[PDB]
Design a protein around this ligand. Structure first.
Ligand SMILES: CCCCCCCCCCCCCCCCCC(=O)OC[C@H](COP(=O)(O)OCCN)OC(=O)CCCCCCCCCCCCCCCCC
Ligand SMILES: CCCCCCCCCCCCCCCCCC(=O)OC[C@H](COP(=O)(O)OCCN)OC(=O)CCCCCCCCCCCCCCCCC
Ligand SMILES: CCCCCCCCCCCCCCCCCC(=O)OC[C@H](COP(=O)(O)OCCN)OC(=O)CCCCCCCCCCCCCCCCC
Ligand SMILES: CCCCCCCCCCC1=C(C)C(=O)C(OC)=C(OC)C1=O
Ligand SMILES: CCCCCCCCCCCCCCCCCCCC
Ligand SMILES: CCCCCCCCCCCCCCCCCCCC
Ligand SMILES: CCCCCCCCCCCCCCCCCCCC
Ligand SMILES: CCCCCCCCCCCCCCCCCCCC
Lengths: 100, 300, 129, 322, 162, 478
């Protein structure tokens, strides 16, 4: 009695919200929340897709997705640590030395 | 050539030097203490730690240091002690121990009270010492007068000094165990302190500040039956001490919190004036009760 | 069935009465008892004397690596959560695969312990000497 | 509203409300019992003057806490400051909301169970974190950081300590767990899991010796020092229902829950829960507090590999007898 | 259950929108926890009980360490808030807003063209996920453990103080 | 279907690489020894490369719902293992330039190699996803290996954010595709449709999002802007690995996904891939015109060559010749990038400080280091598709495949891009010989590797029949 289309629309809405929060924010941290939002929206879409067909494959893909989310969050947090230690500021528009 | 010549007993907003002979001693001579808003603000700003005056280098190029005032009124601060401690995260960078929040001017009182009336003031110098605080003052006064005390006076003063030493060491052990984290043995330790207090109440007539030693002797004689209470305490103590050892002082958590923490060698204990337990723990066997025996300590 | 609906209603009422009791308790705490008018009321407690700066300074921490390793090991933990509820039906092949999994976990933890990670203690004491 | 289904739903709702009222009242009564039991452990009596045996001391404390000035600091974030006692009071209550106290007496017979307990612990950490950050105090900041480190230490292995019981029962349901122990209680096959869950569950409520955030001696009561009024009482009651929840959870996953030879099942559940509550008061009184760096080292290097080895051995034993 | 799914979707949408347009990092993290709890409610509505369980178990651990880094780095009183306020300008966010809107419109139009029969809401236990995870999907688990090992090694190497 | 010891034999390089990854991790934990760890990495990769013989003697098998092993997977496994071995060989002296710890580099190198094996044997959407991230994450590690450097940290941050966003896009597209289809295997992505109803907006949009993610992974326009910044920022062995092994592995899994799925018959996907290939060739060849830096020039070169590869991949459905053309050009591309980036690695080794400049100054290289200059100039001769080199054989195969299926716009784009590539490649080659104003056996080993690559390029350009024969021997399931 839940259409699959509404769940896919919800996942797409959170996906574009995370993309917007990534693009409009120059803070590296808020980019990391943005990335977590897109990853969790894709995982949510996999969960609805698996629930429609009655298969555990969507939940397995969710597990792989959150494993990737945790690993990428740890690596981005380490890079944010290094950037804040070696530049004393967390603006991503200052990371522009390589160009042309 | 002194690095930081600043006041350590009196606040920085203090005029005059207290131990000079022309400075009046009593608070009734001066104006009474009126605490107004302006004086409260000025004295609260004077007590504020200013890190540039000690060269603290507040912050770093990457991350800032954070300053913490532990005392006064901290459960781990055993008294009026304030330490101002600089932290990077958890680690301590440097410490500025600020004292003077417990100044009573007892030397100026020694220039204010007579020879006999100064004994309660000597007794309150260390409030866990009592007769142990009394002993050097009355011995120095007897040196001044030319009085040689008899044997019974020496035995009585040695007994009271050892009783108050047991009381002080019991309190010290209980506070160390509580500061490690075990809150149980302090109650039993204070029960043994109550036994010692019963004995000291029997002899001197007071619990913790006896004010009992005199010039050339003691105040009263020993009452009829002090040996019974001493026998009761000497039976009560060693089993309780073994219980405290087996409950907390052989605990591996207390050992982990205690062993290797703030360790220093003999050179640090000598150049910094450390005496008592630390100096003997560094291997320097300099005890006054053996090297320069006072009050007939050669007979024990 | 009937029992599932009954348990769902019981859980919903449990949550509703829990939040209601907590909010009523907060309201009764806030509305009963007089207030205060003092000069040094709105000062953070730093043991009787004023602060040097504020409480919102950039505090360092040595727990960063352990935090990331905690997240990674909790993901390995969720994998073992998924494994543990179906051990009997997985058979011995699943046991061998989970043994390889836990062996990789143990090798990673030994790698963390030996290289100096999970060791952020200050070099002064370190429970030494 | 005259139907057997509707009266059954109403009876289940009444049972859930009765369970909630009893566990909250038992948490407050066991705050009073902690005072009395610390008196007993430390060779005294504690409060035995307000009524018979001090039984009205709790009412006097409740009256004072309600009529104490509930204070919100100006330098604090008000919403977070008010929100943290709500989480502290409610998260462990919802964790208790899955514990089966008697056959036919359970709020929610979830298919997740101990997963829901892990969820509620992970939500309960935010109460302490938000109380530390929101109050705008340096001691509270240090207490919040210490609480975060301790949470790292225990939550790295809490679920893995429970996975031995989960694997032995073969399911995540609570009633299946308490029915799998109909022959032998789970403390004997899962003993290393038992001690690791004991360590992690004392670290859940931040009770002694794991009172790193609210350390009385070290940080002068820690994170809730700006907290006053009935919010501090909410912190107390929340930690006490946390203790009740962890005790009842050990009863269900290691001692058969309600299962007993002679007494009625709720009586056995009550005796085992009260014994573990007594063990909580004893574990507060008995051994001292370690340094939180050594606490995290012990929780990482010792407890986590022990839980992994115990899970492997339990899986091998289960598949051996199949 | 249908109402639960719809209200959790609405709460997740509103909380995510408040996350991406907030200047307080701790408040943004709080709204993020609210959004992830709403996502968990969506998961629990659809019969994926294990997905919601792991959404509350390990993501609350993930947002925990995000909070530790936020208190370790960003909080300086209002100085972070004004600095974030001067960064966000109207043209700055209306730039990619129309791009996200047209992307959402295209994705929604592609979604609406698929055949549907409605999700029956049949629950999926963790036992079936354990069967499939350690059955047909074994090397997914093993090489995902290797992936987590790689992420751990990289986090160690880059995150070091010195 | 379950796992058999025969399936264990067919999985030999993956098992060997994982086991030796555990081995080098335990050796790092035992003692921080650089020589022993790098050596154990070398025998681990070589053991996988020689277990390829036992995999070939085993045969083609559908080992998992996930994995399928055949000549396609074996060939791409061999290519990524050769790239990993070369990356270790060139990374060794640069790491003796490194002041900090030097042991995690090889550990990440073989973890990325394991991801390459997983992508090579990938016949599932889950395995494709896991291979992409198992390749990406060690590259996040290796690009920011020298975090004290400005450019390495900047490129690490850029690659991490962009690849996490691309992984999010690819995951969402995979979720939409699974929502339409209901099965995650490659062969079942569009099986329920029939009678010309292969086009459906949800499946098409899902495959478009995976196209976005994969085209990020192959630097396809307009997901190409990271390539010069990451290539310049990353260390030279990291640039070697990212140019060779990553590109071969994701392009092999893209070829697999577009061959075994029935969605390859759809004309709209073919049209948008033709547009992407045209834009990639023209943009990558045009942006390397006025480049004064060798690394950004090679990044745009990677963009253009992946455009040529996509041009070859477009004509897969009609002609039966596109797969061996893709394999031949991928082998030539691997050897060309290995030689060129190996010369960059040897002239960048040792690591002479992070604060000191890492500028190349290729001008006048022949007058002091003549052998490396000879390898570099024959490498630029190979990259331009000039005869007596393998790059011409790859370009000839691509052109013949495009002519076979009548894709004339791609042919014209290939010619124009080859002319611009001729210009800048031969400008670099001549600047190697103008008038500009070590002492260890591992640097000699790197010199041997670049000399072997140059000789292989010359021999297989003069005589390309053995490469064609061993590529056609890698005959997968039609
Ligand atoms: C406001 C909330 C009001 C109550 C909402 C409904 C509660 C009941 C519920 O969600 O039940 C669904 C599920 C249990 O379903 P179950 O019985 O396992 O399935 C049928 C058995 N074949 O149980 C669940 O999904 C419960 C798991 C999620 C619970 C979240 C509780 C709040 C967490 C955040 C607090 C802040
Ligand atoms: C309902 C739930 C609750 C039920 C109630 C009953 C169970 C209560 C369980 C309480 C658990 C308390 C755990 C306390 C752990 C403390 C660990 C710690 O911090 O140890 C560190 C300490 C020193 O470490 P060290 O190596 O010296 O320092 C390194 C510095 N270079 O290391 C040492 O001193 C070494 C010894 C460490 C001992 C660790 C704890 C052992 C197990 C817990 C204690 C026993 C509990 C009862 C068990 C059953 C008794 C019948
Ligand atoms: C505003 C207040 C919070 C609003 C959101 C949470 C409550 C939503 C209303 C739920 C009311 C109960 C309900 O509808 O339950 C139905 C269903 C029961 O579970 P199931 O077994 O799937 O259903 C078949 C029954 N035989 O329930 C389900 O399937 C799932 C029920 C909701 C998910 C669990 C609770 C999530 C709470 C999230 C809180 C987020 C922060 C606020
Ligand atoms: C826990 C209830 C009291 C137990 C019995 C006393 C415990 C030891 C108190 C030690 C102490 C002393 C003597 C003390 O003088 C002092 O400074 C004012 C402290 O800080 C508050 C102390 O902690
Ligand atoms: C000290 C005991 C703490 C128990 C906490 C949980 C109690 C919840 C309320 C239970 C009420 C019902 C008890 C069982 C009733 C049915 C059996 C009656 C005969 C024993
Ligand atoms: C200082 C550097 C700042 C960089 C900010 C970049 C912002 C990019 C915003 C792009 C908005 C595009 C909106 C749609 C345009 C029309 C559709 C695409 C082109 C056909
Ligand atoms: C003005 C003098 C120029 C002398 C140029 C000498 C070039 C020698 C080249 C030797 C072979 C290198 C590899 C070619 C392929
Ligand atoms: C700059 C690139 C120019 C490429 C020109 C390609 C011309 C292709 C003509 C195809 C004609 C097809 C007719 C049917």
């Amino acid at each position: 009695m839940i259409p699959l289309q509404h769940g896919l629309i919800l996942a797409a809405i959170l996906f574009v919200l995370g993309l917007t929060g990534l693009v409009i924010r120059r803070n590296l941290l808020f980019m990391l929340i943005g990335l977590e939002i897109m990853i969790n929206a894709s995982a949510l879409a996999f969960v609805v897709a698996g629930s429609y067909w009655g298969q555990t494959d969507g939940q397995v893909m969710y597990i792989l997705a959150i494993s990737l989310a945790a690993a990428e969050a740890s690596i981005g947090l380490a890079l944010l640590l290094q950037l804040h230690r070696r530049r004393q500021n967390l603006n991503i528009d200052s990371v522009s030395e390589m160009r042309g | 050539g002194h690095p930081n010549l600043r006041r350590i007993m009196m606040p920085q907003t203090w005029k005059g030097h207290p131990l000079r002979k022309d400075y009046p001693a009593r608070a009734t001579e001066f104006s009474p203490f009126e605490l107004t808003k302006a004086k409260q603000d000025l004295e609260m700003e004077a007590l504020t730690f200013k890190p540039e005056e000690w060269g603290m280098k507040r912050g770093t190029e990457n991350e800032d240091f954070m300053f913490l005032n532990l005392g006064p009124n901290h459960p781990s601060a055993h008294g009026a002690f304030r330490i101002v401690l600089q932290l990077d995260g958890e680690e301590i960078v440097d410490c500025v121990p600020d004292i003077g929040y417990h100044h009573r001017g007892a030397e100026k009182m020694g220039e204010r009270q007579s020879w006999h009336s100064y004994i309660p003031y000597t007794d309150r110098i260390e409030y866990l010492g009592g007769c142990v605080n009394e002993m050097p003052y009355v011995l120095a006064v007897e040196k001044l007068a030319g009085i040689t005390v008899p044997d019974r006076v020496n035995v009585i003063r040695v007994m009271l000094s050892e009783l108050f030493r047991i009381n002080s060491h019991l309190l010290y052990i209980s506070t160390f165990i509580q500061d490690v984290g075990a809150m149980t043995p302090v109650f039993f330790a204070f029960t043994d302190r109550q036994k010692i207090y019963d004995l000291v109440e029997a002899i001197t007539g007071f619990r913790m500040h006896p004010a009992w030693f005199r010039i050339g002797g003691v105040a009263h004689d020993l009452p009829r039956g002090w040996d019974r209470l001493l026998r009761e305490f000497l039976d009560w103590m060693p089993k309780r001490l073994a219980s405290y050892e087996k409950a907390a002082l052989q605990n591996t958590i207390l050992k982990g919190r205690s062993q290797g923490v703030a360790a220093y060698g003999a050179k640090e204990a000598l150049e910094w004036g450390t005496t008592g337990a630390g100096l003997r723990a560094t291997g320097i066997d300099f005890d006054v009760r053996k090297a320069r025996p006072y009050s007939g300590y050669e007979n024990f | 069935s009937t029992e599932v609906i009954a348990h769902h209603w019981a859980f919903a009422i449990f949550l509703i009465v829990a939040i209601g009791l907590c909010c009523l308790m907060l309201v009764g705490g806030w509305f009963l008892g007089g207030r205060a008018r003092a000069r040094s009321k709105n000062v953070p407690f730093e043991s009787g004397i004023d602060s040097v700066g504020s409480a919102r300074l950039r505090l360092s921490a040595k727990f960063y690596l352990v935090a990331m390793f905690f997240v990674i090991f909790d993901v390995e933990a969720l994998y073992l959560f998924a494994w543990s509820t179906s051990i009997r039906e997985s058979g011995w092949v699943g046991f061998v695969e989970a043994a390889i999994f836990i062996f990789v976990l143990l090798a990673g933890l030994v790698y963390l312990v030996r290289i100096g990670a999970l060791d952020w203690t200050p070099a002064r004491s370190r429970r030494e000497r | 509203w005259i139907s057997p289904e509707l009266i059954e739903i109403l009876l289940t709702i009444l049972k859930a409300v009765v369970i909630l009222l009893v566990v909250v009242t038992c948490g407050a009564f066991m705050s009073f019992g902690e005072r009395r039991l610390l008196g007993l452990f430390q060779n005294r009596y504690g409060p035995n003057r307000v009524g018979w045996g001090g039984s009205l001391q709790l009412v006097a404390d409740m009256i004072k806490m309600f009529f104490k000035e509930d204070w919100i600091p100006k330098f604090s974030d008000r919403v977070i400051f008010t929100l943290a006692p709500m989480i502290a009071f409610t998260s462990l209550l919802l964790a208790f909301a899955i514990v089966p106290v008697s056959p036919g007496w359970v709020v929610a017979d979830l298919n997740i169970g101990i997963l829901f307990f892990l969820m509620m612990a992970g939500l309960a950490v935010y109460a302490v974190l938000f109380a530390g950050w929101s109050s705008n105090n340096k001691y509270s900041l240090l207490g919040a950081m210490r609480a975060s480190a301790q949470t790292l230490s225990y939550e790295v292995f809490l679920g893995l300590s429970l996975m031995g019981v989960v694997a032995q029962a073969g399911s995540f349901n609570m009633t299946d767990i308490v029915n799998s122990q109909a022959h032998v209680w789970n403390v004997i096959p899962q003993f290393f899991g038992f001690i690791t869950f004991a360590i992690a569950g004392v670290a859940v409520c931040h009770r002694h010796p794991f009172d790193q955030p609210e350390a009385e001696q070290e940080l002068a009561d820690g994170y809730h020092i700006e907290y006053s009024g009935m919010k501090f009482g909410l912190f107390f009651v929340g930690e006490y229902i946390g203790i009740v929840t962890i005790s009842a959870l050990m009863v269900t996953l290691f001692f058969g829950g309600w299962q007993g030879p002679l007494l009625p099942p709720f009586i056995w559940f009550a005796l085992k829960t009260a014994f573990f509550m007594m063990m909580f008061i004893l574990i507060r009184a008995s051994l001292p507090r370690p340094r939180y760096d050594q606490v995290m080292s012990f929780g990482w290097k010792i407890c986590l590999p022990l839980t992994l080895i115990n899970l492997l051995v339990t899986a091998a034993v289960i598949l051996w007898q199949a | 259950m249908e109402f639960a799914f719809y209200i959790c979707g609405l709460i997740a949408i509103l909380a995510t929108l408040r996350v991406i347009t907030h200047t307080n990092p701790v408040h943004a993290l709080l709204y993020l926890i609210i959004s992830l709890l709403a996502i968990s409610g969506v998961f629990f509505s659809l019969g994926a009980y294990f997905a919601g369980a792991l959404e509350i178990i390990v993501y609350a651990g993930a947002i925990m360490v995000l909070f530790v880094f936020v208190v370790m780095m960003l909080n300086l009183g209002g100085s972070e808030i004004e600095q974030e306020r001067q960064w966000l300008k109207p043209q700055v966010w209306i730039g990619p807003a129309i791009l996200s809107a047209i992307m959402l419109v295209v994705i929604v139009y592609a979604i609406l063209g698929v055949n549907d029969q409605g999700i029956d809401g049949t629950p999926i236990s963790a036992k079936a996920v354990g069967i499939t995870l350690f059955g047909p999907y074994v090397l997914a688990v093993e090489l995902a453990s290797m992936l987590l090992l790689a992420g751990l090694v990289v986090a160690f190497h880059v995150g070091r103080e010195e | 279907m379950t796992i058999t010891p025969q399936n264990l034999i067919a999985l030999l390089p993956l098992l060997i690489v994982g086991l030796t990854v555990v081995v080098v991790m335990l050796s790092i934990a035992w003692r921080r020894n650089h020589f022993l760890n790098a050596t154990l990495s070398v025998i681990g990769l070589n053991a996988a490369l020689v277990s390829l013989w036992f995999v070939g003697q085993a045969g083609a098998m559908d080992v998992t719902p996930l994995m399928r092993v055949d000549g396609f997977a074996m060939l791409y496994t061999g290519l990524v293992l050769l790239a990993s071995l070369a990356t270790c060989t060139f990374a060794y002296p640069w790491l003796e330039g490194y002041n900090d710890n030097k042991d995690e580099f090889y550990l990440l190198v073989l973890i990325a190699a394991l991801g390459g094996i997983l992508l090579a044997n990938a016949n599932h959407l889950a395995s494709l996803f896991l291979g992409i991230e198992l390749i990406s994450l060690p590259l996040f590690g290796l690009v920011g290996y020298a975090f004290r450097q400005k450019r390495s940290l900047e490129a690490s941050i850029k690659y991490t954010i962009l690849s996490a966003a691309a992984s999010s896009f690819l995951l969402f597209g995979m979720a939409l595709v699974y929502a339409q289809s209901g099965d995650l295997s490659f062969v079942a992505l569009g099986k329920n449709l029939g009678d010309g109803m292969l086009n459906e907006p949800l499946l098409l949009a899902g495959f478009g999002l995976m196209i976005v993610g994969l085209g990020f992974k192959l630097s396809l326009v307009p997901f190409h802007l990271w390539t010069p910044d990451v290539y310049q920022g990353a260390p030279a062995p990291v640039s070697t690995f990212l140019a060779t092994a990553s590109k071969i592995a994701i392009f092999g899994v893209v070829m697999r996904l577009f061959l075994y799925a029935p969605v390859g018959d759809s004309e709209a996907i073919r049209v948008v891939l033709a547009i992407i290939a045209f834009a990639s060739i023209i943009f990558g060849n045009l942006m390397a015109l006025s480049q004064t830096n060798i690394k950004r020039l090679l990044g745009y070169s990677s963009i253009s060559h992946l455009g040529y590869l996509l041009v070859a991949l477009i004509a897969l459905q009609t002609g039966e010749m596109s797969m061996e053309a893709v394999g031949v050009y991928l082998a030539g591309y691997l050897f060309s990038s290995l030689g060129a980036f190996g010369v960059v690695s040897l002239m960048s080794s040792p690591y002479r400080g992070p604060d000191a400049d890492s500028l190349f100054s290729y001008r006048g290289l022949f007058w002091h280091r003549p052998i490396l200059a000879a390898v570099m100039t024959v490498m630029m001769l190979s990259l331009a598709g000039i005869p007596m080199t393998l790059g011409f054989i790859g370009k000839f195969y691509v052109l013949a495949v495009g002519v076979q299926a009548h894709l004339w716009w791609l042919v014209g784009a290939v010619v124009v891009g080859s002319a611009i590539g001729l210009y800048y490649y031969l400008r670099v080659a001549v600047s190697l010989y103008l008038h500009a104003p070590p002492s260890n056996w591992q640097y000699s080993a790197g010199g041997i590797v670049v000399l072997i690559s140059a000789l292989l390029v010359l021999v297989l350009g003069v005589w390309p029949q053995p490469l064609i024969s061993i590529v056609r021997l890698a005959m997968p399931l039609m």
